[PDB]
Amino acid sequence: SLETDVENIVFQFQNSSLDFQSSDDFSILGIDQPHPIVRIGGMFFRGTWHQPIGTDIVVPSVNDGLVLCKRRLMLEQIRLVPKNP
Amino acid sequence: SLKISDNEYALIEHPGFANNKDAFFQTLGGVQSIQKACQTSFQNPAAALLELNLRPKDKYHHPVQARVQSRNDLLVTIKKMDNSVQNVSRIRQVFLFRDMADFQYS
Ligand SMILES: [Hg+2]
Ligand SMILES: [Hg+2]
């Protein structure tokens, strides 16, 4: 069946055309913050938490089953713009 | 930092709730039906299909087919103690039941 130490979180992107592939570098600043910052490859994102109405089921392909009721992170791409030239 | 893994998943965006697990899984035809639906999505993506039935004993209820799509969603596993990222995996396909006209709620 599928299961409802570690937590699992869906990351959803405002721009669904951005390509994130395996081997791409991934890091997060502030997963505990209301607005985490995520870096993937050379791209940066700012996240916002959102609670969809309903439940997610996540099912694995053949890798070497989850039921998620909690929040997902909604990520918009950002530019890091110097406040002063 | 950490590199995104090879692991992949399918995601079902269900509009109801898992308080009654058996009833909940049954709305999609049961656990085996869910696994069959996920396996098809990987073996033959174009053919992927899943049906939702929230009110099985109600003769006016119309079972609904998911809209199937890919985005670039990721599944992020974090170790609860230190909030460190243990794993990142791609969600390669999504079965979209939320946000169809039937299940809208505001
Ligand atoms: Hg929940
Ligand atoms: Hg699968």
Author numbering:
A (entry chain B): 7 to 10, 14 to 73, 80 to 100
B (entry chain A): 3 to 108
Paper text:
Well-diffracting crystals were obtained for a Sfc11-110(K48A,Q49A)/Sfc71-101 construct, where two non-conserved Sfc1 residues (K48 and Q49) were mutated into alanine following the suggestion of the surface entropy reduction prediction (SERp) server. The structure was solved at 2.4 Å by single-wavelength anomalous diffraction using para-chloro-mercuribenzene sulfonate as heavy-atom derivate. The interwoven structure suggests that the subunits fold co-operatively and need to be simultaneously expressed. The crystal structure also confirmed that the mutated residues K48 and Q49 lay at the surface of the Sfc1 dimerization domain and do not interfere with Sfc1–Sfc7 heterodimerization. According to program Dali, the structure shares the highest similarity with the TFIIF Rap30/Rap74 dimerization domains. Sfc1 and Sfc7 resemble Rap30 and Rap74, respectively (Z-score = 9.3, rmsd154CA = 4.7 Å). Despite the readily apparent structural similarity between Sfc1 and Rap30 and Sfc7 and Rap74, Sfc1 helices α1 to α3 and β-strands β3 and β4 replace Rap30 strands β3 and β4 (approximately residues 20–68), whereas the ‘arm domain’ of Rap74 is absent in Sfc7. The Sfc1-NT/Sfc7 dimerization domain can also be superimposed with the dimerization modules of Pol I subunits A49/A34.5 (Z-score = 7.7, rmsd142CA = 4.2 Å) and mouse RNase H2B/H2C (Z-score = 7.8, rmsd134CA = 3.7 Å).
Type 2 promoters contain two gene-internal DNA-binding elements named A- and B-box that are recognized by the general transcription factor IIIC (TFIIIC). We therefore structurally characterized the S. pombe TFIIIC Sfc1/Sfc7 subcomplex and present crystal structures of two structural modules. The N-terminal moiety of Sfc1 (Sfc1-NT) and subunit Sfc7 heterodimerize through a triple β-barrel fold most similar to the dimerization domains of general transcription factor TFIIF Rap30/Rap74, whereas the C-terminal DNA-binding domain of Sfc1 (Sfc1-DBD) comprises a winged-helix domain most similar to the winged-helix domain present in TFIIF Rap30 that is packed against a second domain with novel fold.
